[PDB]
Structure 1
Amino acid sequence: TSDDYVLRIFAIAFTRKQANQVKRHSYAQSSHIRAIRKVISEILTKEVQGSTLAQLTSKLIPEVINKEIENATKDIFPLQNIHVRKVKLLKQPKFDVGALMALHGEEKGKKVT
């Protein structure tokens, strides 16, 4: 991410049959799979690098990333059940208490007597 958070994403997608499709099956040629995989990797890289970790999560909750993968891949091959399967946090920067407090939105004690 832009905040130096190294993370790994997994995206999973499936082919679907058109409305008027008569064939039983909807396999895609290996060229399409490689073409789809290239597009999916690009978008995941574009979003995360152009974002912070907090901003990234704000994208996951509405699942806007999935809709963009569909809109990008709509030309290549119809797809269904596109989802961000998993996210791993490989490495973290030096801890910054200031950033954490801002994310969460100091106190004098009580005299003991």
Structure 2
Amino acid sequence: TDKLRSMVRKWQTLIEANVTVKTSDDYVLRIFAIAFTRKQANQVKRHSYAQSSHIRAIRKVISEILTKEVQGSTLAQLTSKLIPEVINKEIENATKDIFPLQNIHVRKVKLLK
């Protein structure tokens, strides 16, 4: 919560993704995402915003990875995936060729079934 507030710096862009997904058995969960565009240092210009079709494709690749990891091998094993941020560094790997990021997290854990 206050972690999220410490995340929020001005002059930069917020990227949130969200997806609803069932596990193997009848347990459905909506997972979130937070990711901030970081300054790729050697910057002169002060802000480092994104380019707003960047944000579309970044949200889509994040949601894609969120769909690929879940509905395979239930939330026990999916939590075992979520612990060492294999997912978040995969986000880093897939996103970094366009604009890298910072503060890459899924930010929440909650069920709805």
Q: Normalising TM by the smaller chain, what interval?
A: 0.7 to 0.9
Distance 1:45 1:87 in 2: 15
| 1:8 paired residue number | 30
Q: Which runs of 5+ in 1 are unaligned?
A: 92-113
1:7-63: CA deviations, max 9, x gaps?
011110001111211110100011000010000000001100222111011112212
Distance 1:29 1:63 in 2: 26
Larger-Rg structure: 1
Per the normalisation by structure 2, the TM-score is 0.76
Query: Equivalent residue of 2:80, what SS?
Result: helix
**Structure 1 residue identity aligned to 2:42:** N
**Structure 2 residue identity aligned to 1:6:** V
| 1:70 paired residue number | 92
**More helix by percentage:** 1
**Structure 2 residue identity aligned to 1:18:** Q
Per the normalisation by structure 1, the TM-score is 0.76
| 2:55 paired residue number | 33
Is 1:43 equivalent to 2:61 in the alignment? no
Q: Percent identity?
A: 100
Query: RMSD of the TM alignment (CA)?
Result: 1.1
Aligned residues: 91
Distance 2:92 2:26 in 1: 28
Distance 1:76 1:86 in 2: 26
Distance 1:21 1:4 in 2: 49
**More strand by percentage:** 1
Distance 1:19 1:35 in 2: 23
Relative contact order: is structure 1 or structure 2 higher (C-alpha 8 Å, sep ≥ 6)? 1
Give runs of ≥4 in structure 1 deviating > 6 Å.
Answer: none
